Design a protein around this nucleic acid. Sequence first.
DNA 1: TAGTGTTTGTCGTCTCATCT
RNA 2: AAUUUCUACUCUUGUAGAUAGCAGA
DNA 3: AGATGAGACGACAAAGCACTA
Length: 1244
Amino acid sequence: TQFEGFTNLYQVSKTLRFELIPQGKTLKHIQEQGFIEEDKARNDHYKELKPIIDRIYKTYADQCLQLVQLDWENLSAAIDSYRKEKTEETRNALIEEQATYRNAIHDYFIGRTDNLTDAINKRHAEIYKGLFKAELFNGKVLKQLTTTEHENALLRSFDKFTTYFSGFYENRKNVFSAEDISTAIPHRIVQDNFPKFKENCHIFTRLITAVPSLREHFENVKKAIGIFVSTSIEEVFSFPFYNQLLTQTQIDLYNQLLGGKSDEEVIQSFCKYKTLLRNENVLETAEALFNELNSIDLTHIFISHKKLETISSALCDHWDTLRNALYERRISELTGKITKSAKEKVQRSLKHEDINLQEIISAAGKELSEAFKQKTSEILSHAHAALDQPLPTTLKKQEEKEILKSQLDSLLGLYHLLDWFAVDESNEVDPEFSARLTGIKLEMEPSLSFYNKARNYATKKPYSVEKFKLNFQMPTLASGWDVNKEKCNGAILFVKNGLYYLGIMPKQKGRYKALSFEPTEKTSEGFDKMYYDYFPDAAKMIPKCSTQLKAVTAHFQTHTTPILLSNNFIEPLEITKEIYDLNNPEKEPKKFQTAYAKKTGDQKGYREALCKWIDFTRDFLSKYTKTTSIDLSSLRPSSQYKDLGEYYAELNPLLYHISFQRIAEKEIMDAVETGKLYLFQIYNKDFAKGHHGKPNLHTLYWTGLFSPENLAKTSIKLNGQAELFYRPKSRMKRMAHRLGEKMLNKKLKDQKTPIPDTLYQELYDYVNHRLSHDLSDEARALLPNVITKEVSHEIIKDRRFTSDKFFFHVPITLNYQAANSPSKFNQRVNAYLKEHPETPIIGIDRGERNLIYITVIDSTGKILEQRSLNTIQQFDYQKKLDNREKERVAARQAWSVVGTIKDLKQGYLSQVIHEIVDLMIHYQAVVVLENLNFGFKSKRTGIAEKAVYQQFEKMLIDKLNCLVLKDYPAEKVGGVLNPYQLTDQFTSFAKMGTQSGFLFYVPAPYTSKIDPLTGFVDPFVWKTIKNHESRKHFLEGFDFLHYDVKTGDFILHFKMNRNLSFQRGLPGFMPAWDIVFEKNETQFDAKGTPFIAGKRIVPVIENHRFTGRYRDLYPANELIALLEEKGIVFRDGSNILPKLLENDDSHAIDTMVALIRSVLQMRNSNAATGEDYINSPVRDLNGVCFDSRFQNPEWPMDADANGAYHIALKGQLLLNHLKESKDLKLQNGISNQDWLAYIQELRN
DNA sequence: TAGTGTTTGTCGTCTCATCT
RNA sequence: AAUUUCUACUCUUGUAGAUAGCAGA
DNA sequence: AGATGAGACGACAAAGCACTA
């Protein structure tokens, strides 16, 4: 099983795009006929027609909801039982009960409810059937039903033209669906409004029982308005009335009984919403609510569990403190022998329940109240200071964009604060507080969309990529390329001197005139027209065109003798009665399908019927008009065919064929001149006259589609259903590099270091002698290093959108001869890997000093190669460009900068995809990524968490589904004819497992802070130790600390069976460890650059601000300094820890604990001095601790090298587990304990 | 009494309940 | 600063890589 | 928690009907 055998496995479809350049006078004819303006009127009638069409849905849905009468008592009991017992049995009971009620509403729409009679029930089915297709435009559905006359007009306007309404049809199915989707009407009734209405009835009866005078008072309010005159106040708070609360007019009356594109558009709309917040006095109402919390009962003010961790991180040291403080106080009030089961019950309770504010204060201390008060006034003051601050006049300057974002941050900050409180009625919420909070919470709700709408207004490019499809009054334009359907579709392809032209023939003067081109000899100069000949699928076409004809069926039903067909046949086709009888039996399993043989066993009759059917099929192929000549004899004899499946799989490729015939140039040019044909050259900058160099992949697909070898034997299919588009020019400010100016390169003379953006713009302005300001000192120093360029020719920025452009979307099917879908791809991958035990591993990790780092390991774990992918094609992404982008973010903190950073990240990951696939193909290795489910990356990494990287994995999977290398020849596997198929088709981010073809996924955590020589990891959770007694207990856990006089290194023997309270719970292998304090000698690497052994970089300066700045540290030096200062002897090699405890000095003990933490900190980095390395605090079997500063080629170079290398080892673990296991299945994830045990057993 | 302009044929994969 | 169009770019009226479009979040 | 199973939807030429002479 060669690695090159992973090709032609399953079909893959791609949609190529091209820009159509009108040829000759075709643009003049199109403008004269007004096809573009009519299509613009069509796409704009879409929005005009959409509300008109919605009248049908609104009316029909409203009419169906008027007859709904249900007993909601069962649904209420399922809601009560789930709130009563929080068990998974009551949850599934409620989920099923909701699905039952949703279907009860759905049966009113489709007409399958027992509550309505057959006459009414069947009338709804006749409407719901044609409710999501072209029957909306017939007026038939409207004839069953309510509309303006403009409706008739505009619905008649898309008759036989419902293509644009495709996705819209799905959006309307989401409205009437019975599934548990929030877009639907049944879901809104069952799971949204009824729990609200059910809660309203409970709030009502509780108030009336406690305060009976409130009953007559509520009744007076209902009578004084005029709503629900036939219904008393007790009945509107009873379940049967909810059946009359299913329509908007009734919902509006119910709610009223309770209640009584441009720059200036964002300023006028926000200031209108902003000035509305003053009149409602929502700030004064909010400031009054949070002031109530100082005196009201806080046992009924509840905090949402979904926000408790966020509040803990915003008001306390960590996210842990609140959940932990509540845990300790609840364990403090348990009864009897507190087992470990009772503790786990308290843990699980804190994950999914709302905590009242009093229990939080009683468990966290008075310092939370001060944090709650300070944070509340801080947010309220910023929102108060932003409502009176006026917006600027325009968004032209960045200083004016900043104040708009600043005021939105204050508005979103208050909106964030209000979502701290639980909204669900499951808790005993305060009467007045919950009403006043819910009021201002809903009045601050539009501020969230205003934040996103405003950020999108200014994080958008100056373009306008909006386009509308062109139909040319052709309902099925470019639907199929077949020559027979050429007249009905009107779309053909040409090719001339290597240039591909698209031609379409519009209707002539409102009528269909067919252009009959005359083929000539190849010696005649002219175009070459594609003669697309197709026959979709024999399995469906042969019965339809031969024996499923209505005339044939009628003749056989009425008459018995065989019939002859002389229509659409070169020679008449003889059809017998028996072939029809076999194709039309009295049982569902026909004798043709394997089901008959499976359920009967009559193999002889099965084979005889199959042979007769195949003979009839061959005769039909011979006798049919279009297939009479297409190489029918190439098939194998009919007798030995096993089943119809293989015969059709063999016959279908032979039916499809593409041929080219020379057509005189004069005829095509005269057709274009007359207006009968619209020529369009297909252009993608790879057909330009200035082109030189390897082309795009889509250009290669297009070229190889029409290659002679592909024409002779199909491998790329030209599918139908093509589309044409048109993009109006969208220019708002035209800038170009005109002749005589001076262009500045965005790179220095080294061609790898990009200029900072602001410095580049300033230098470009200065070079053209058009800068008023003097050059800055840094810019002046940078100027000698930059290279400027003269303008040879004009270069218009964003020239793509300075003129109207046509477009052509054509789909292709790569690997046409393969199967429709992959069949157990992972099993084949595992078989290949098992049969090739020496296949290397590729590990990819996101570093911190580089965006993407990769290391490849062989079967034995040796590093074959470690490379940095932060520089691609002579351009530094991480070390230079992303650093300047981050500096610009820190200097301004705008939105457009963040958007540009995201776009740059996406582009860089695209280049990384190319590099990864290149390395894959070179090494024939299996690539191991990291699954984003487990762990998260620190903010120091260049790549974000799960946002950009997760899309990168999907893009890599898609690339490897059909991988073509442009340097490879077409014939060789990997070229455009035989692409590599190395991964299964992507389905979903959650659905993909630990393996996807040659892509493996291993858990992210525990891959970087690991000693590559020993597998040692820092076991202590330093956040646990806080007090002096904790430090004493931690320090007394270790066995001894004796100073080796001969080597000058301290040895701190530690056993994993100690200090379990401070460990992370991962023993692994190696029960005992020997932590070593390296003597600070100056070691030399391969390059000879000196470095101090044992050097550590620590950020601990102050307890809270322990990350302000990194500090140098050499643990041995200050260890011996402290020992000398404290008057303790250590040169004798005696134990030191008991002496330290005997000294009982808090400063010495705290410094010792800090030293242990620092020495156990392996990854030491300092961006200011360009330092990033890992130092092992323990010795391996060789007797030396790892030090990446030695730059040993066989060991990781730096910390990112460590991460990538250990990801590769995790992938190797998975591969070895596969190899040893008999079954071809990969273990679902690797446990941290299991991985640690494996690596520590391997290293030791 | 023609003639000019949407449905069908069966097979493939998806997609919600479901036996084991 | 020139792109089916997205990123980065310029000795090269273009370069390297990626690119499955339609409708809608 | 992996299955089978009924039902629905994509593929596209050509058969085959809705309007006009």
